[PDB]
Design an enzyme around this catalytic site. Structure first.
Site, PDB file in Angstrom:
ATOM      1  N   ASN A  47      62.468  43.320 -31.271  1.00 55.46           N
ATOM      2  CA  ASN A  47      62.698  43.199 -32.664  1.00 55.46           C
ATOM      3  C   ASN A  47      61.377  43.830 -33.432  1.00 55.46           C
ATOM      4  OD1 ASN A  47      65.168  41.308 -31.701  1.00 55.46           O
ATOM      5  ND2 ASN A  47      65.578  43.092 -31.866  1.00 55.46           N
ATOM      6  N   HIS A  93      59.145  40.929 -34.018  1.00 55.82           N
ATOM      7  CA  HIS A  93      59.433  39.657 -34.572  1.00 55.82           C
ATOM      8  C   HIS A  93      58.659  38.580 -33.600  1.00 55.82           C
ATOM      9  CE1 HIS A  93      61.918  40.395 -37.770  1.00 55.82           C
ATOM     10  NE2 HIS A  93      62.787  41.391 -37.424  1.00 55.82           N
ATOM     11  N   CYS A 116      55.923  34.313 -39.535  1.00 59.57           N
ATOM     12  CA  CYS A 116      54.980  34.553 -39.934  1.00 59.57           C
ATOM     13  C   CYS A 116      55.135  36.042 -39.719  1.00 59.57           C
ATOM     14  CB  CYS A 116      53.765  33.896 -38.543  1.00 59.57           C
ATOM     15  SG  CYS A 116      51.950  35.074 -38.327  1.00 59.57           S
TER      16      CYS A 116
END
Ligand SMILES: CN[C@@H]1CCCN(c2ccccc2)C1=O
Ligand SMILES: CN[C@@H]1CCCN(c2ccccc2)C1=O
Lengths: 264, 265
Positions: free
Chosen positions: B186, B188, B223
């Site tokens: 995804n 991330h 992050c």
């Protein structure tokens, strides 16, 4: 995994893991490169190797990659079984060549293939050595004598000469440092990290609208754990790119290569 | 892998790979963290998840990690088979807890164990919310009703409060950026990357003469792919303890905090 009936090649099946896939839910090219590395390692272990050889250890000689060429037709999806057959062959006094064929375990179709060229060098002085007769006879028994090429084609993209990227580069990723997860069991940055670093300079838009079909990478120098790398790319065109990894300081070339992408 | 006989836990065996081991020729703590992640993902798939429920996808809700605690007694060597049993449990309206037990497939002895705490959050607004009854009833059927804790102990190191590292830090690793291999399906940053980044500020000498026994990590903020991280460490101690801090290189916004415990080889 296991050696085939004749003991002149090795096969291994892998199930694709959740953390091994990208945005499209298919294995990344670094996951494939890791599996090729793993099946080649298992093949060496199965025939009494443990780098390799007993007389090579005595002279402090190791096998290093000079070139890696990977072509993918279909990336295995997360949850799929991929079967990889690998074998090694002698290229005279120049060195060895290791080949791979990737297949779908359900259909048996070839979903990709890879080739690599390895040279002999002194672990300590880094000086390339031409393969000696006494060393050749030690591994020749585990290789087919007749040619067995994953890339047979007359003038294929695996044996092409790669040029040096001219400044200024069109795209760049600067200040790249390897972390401990990038090192191997001997504290060296493994060949797969260079592939990931090469692809960092490819713009995100190209990654989002294209699939990597081919990657040819030439290894000129090893990156130390305390070295910083700059990744440079230029479109030379399906989309083609010319690549260059170099040390952030002096600009010493560590890698050069080419990639080819197809529209999704 | 497969769900156990009662369908209230999942088991999976893994063979340790060449690129998964460190200098000791044993699996790294990031390899273990990847296998825990994998067995937990296979457990969700085996009972009809993707680990969001029907009510969750409708409201744009996701499960996020708030804490990860990993304790290793013996790291599996390259070529060894390691068996991991995992299960999930409800911690009331606070959220869920996922536990793991790592065993040697040859001897059957426990070579490690992990625990994690997950909170519910809106994917878009990043706002936490308590677990609603209609969402709780969807996954409760796949969890044991009686407590089943990998870390039962009265005063265990898994539930301790972690303090914030005071400046100046004793050790540091500056300018850490994630690459595409650090992202998940995804886009991330994987939770495992934060672990690797935490351990980057640990000095090489400690790594060479010690084995990581415990790691407790608190997740405060995710992050972004285009964010730069600073890793900070301070010795707080036969065995060595460290206090850790991940923060954004710019503003100094805290993204992670934690502790590690090492023992002499
Ligand atoms: C890295 N290249 C090496 C050099 C020669 C020996 N060798 C090999 C051959 C057959 C079976 C197993 C290993 C290799 O692959
Ligand atoms: C963060 N924890 C998630 C969400 C809650 C339910 N759940 C789960 C429970 C039983 C089997 C499979 C998955 C999880 O893992």
């Amino acid at each position: 995994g296991s050696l085939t009936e004749d003991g002149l090649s090795y096969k291994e099946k892998f199930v694709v893991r959740s953390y091994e896939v990208g945005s499209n839910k298919t294995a990344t090219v670094e996951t494939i490169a890791n599996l090729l590395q793993e099946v080649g390692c298992n093949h060496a272990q199965s025939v009494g190797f443990s780098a390799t050889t007993t007389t090579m250890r005595k002279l402090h000689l190791i096998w290093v990659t000079a070139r890696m060429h990977i072509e993918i037709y279909k990336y295995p999806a997360w949850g799929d079984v991929v079967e990889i057959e690998t074998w090694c062959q002698s290229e005279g006094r120049i060195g060895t060549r290791r080949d791979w064929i990737l297949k779908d375990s359900v259909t048996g179709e070839v979903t990709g293939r890879a080739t690599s060229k390895w040279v002999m060098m002194n672990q300590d002085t880094r000086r390339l050595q031409k393969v000696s007769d006494d060393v050749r006879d030690e591994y020749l028994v585990f290789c087919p004598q007749e040619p067995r090429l994953a890339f047979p084609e007359e003038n294929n993209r695996s044996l092409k000469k790669i040029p040096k990227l001219e400044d200024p580069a069109q795209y760049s990723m600067i200040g790249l440092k390897p972390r401990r997860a990038d090192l191997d069991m001997n504290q060296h940055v493994n060949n797969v990290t260079y592939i990931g670093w090469v692809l960092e300079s490819i713009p995100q838009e190209i990654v989002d609208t294209h699939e990597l079909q081919v990657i040819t990478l030439d290894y000129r120098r090893e990156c130390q754990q305390d070295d910083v790398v700059d990744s440079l790319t230029t479109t030379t065109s399906d989309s083609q790119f010319l690549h260059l990894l170099r040390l952030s300081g002096d600009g010493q070339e560590i890698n050069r290569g080419t990639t080819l992408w197809r529209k999704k």
